[PDB]
Nucleic acid binder design. Sequence first.
DNA 1: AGGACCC
DNA 2: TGGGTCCT
Length: 373
Amino acid sequence: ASSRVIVHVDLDCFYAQVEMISNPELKDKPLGVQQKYLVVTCNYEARKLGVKKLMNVRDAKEKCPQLVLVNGEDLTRYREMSYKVTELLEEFSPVVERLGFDENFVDLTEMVEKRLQQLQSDELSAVTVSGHVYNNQSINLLDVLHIRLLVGSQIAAEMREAMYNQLGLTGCAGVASNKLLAKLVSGVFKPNQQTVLLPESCQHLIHSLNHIKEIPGIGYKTAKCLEALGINSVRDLQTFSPKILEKELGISVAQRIQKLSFGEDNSPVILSGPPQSFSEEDSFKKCSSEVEAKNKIEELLASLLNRVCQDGRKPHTVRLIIRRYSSEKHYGRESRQCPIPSHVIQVMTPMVDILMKLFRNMTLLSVCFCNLK
DNA sequence: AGGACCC
DNA sequence: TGGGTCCT
Ligand SMILES: Nc1nc2c(ncn2[C@H]2C[C@H](O)[C@@H](COP(=O)(O)OP(=O)(O)OP(=O)(O)O)O2)c(=O)[nH]1
Ligand SMILES: [Mg+2]
Ligand SMILES: [Mg+2]
């Protein structure tokens, strides 16, 4: 165990794809999926006419006064397609990690080896790549790593073909030696295509980024922290002092993100399996009188109980979260967590008041069933 | 309970 | 600015 072959699968404008499949007439027409006053995503037809992901509806129409919009506030169908995608990938190989509703990581290492052991000391020279080779790098057929990654690209091509034939979905794939690289390379050729990264091009890929914030693992916060330290480019982070970074972000975050700056990342692909929680939200124009407005909470449970049910397992914890309007609270949420009566587990009425008591003890409102068993 | 990070 | 995961 050492050299891994990882694939990162990323779908094209996921919500938009699901909507276009539902109502065909929406195809070829610029399509935007809306949630409240946002256009969370849109089909490529729309991205051509200026529409960008997460853009105000207005700024969206005064940019494309023809953009068709559909409401994507109810995630039911997106969530269902998302699991169908994951299950299909799991068939190729069980260790699949979900990242959001449209990205999956699959460790193909075991699968690549088995396929190689099947080839003969001849046809192994006929091994070819499927899709793009990052930085148009030359393949060396005598390099065992090159061969493994190429088989990896073949598998990826099979997965994408399967996703399309069995689910009607198009998407990108990135093949590399680790999750970091696979995720970074899957987006090089953006629409419905795939790319494989050979080792000699790792630094080229990492340095192609324009800021550290672009590195998976480095968020909005850490990015700002690094700035205040004079660290802006990927090379700055690579060359920065381990000590100062270690003594200001924690030996953990520090030693880990500096590895990332070099394209190094040994995190394993984790088998996501069933969800660890179930939650539904509802933001509204500061329309909550602090009371009686819990009829909204009854709505949430309605679906949640239907979802938590279907699943099979039962939650042993419930929660409520809220927000409050005022200044520019860049981060402000509150929640009251509490166990669920063993009797009530095995229906709404009880739960309703249960959340109500949790309510009083305290713009948005969301119930979250967690601690599944 | 709250925080950070991600899609 | 509709959901999730895991760490402090
Ligand atoms: N509400 C919300 N949805 C998001 C956010 N980031 C991504 N999504 C949603 C909208 C898309 O249908 C779906 C896919 O996310 P992605 O980051 O992969 O982008 P997308 O598939 O939309 O397009 P792309 O991969 O760039 O072709 O997830 C976010 O911050 N908020
Ligand atoms: Mg994505
Ligand atoms: Mg995507």
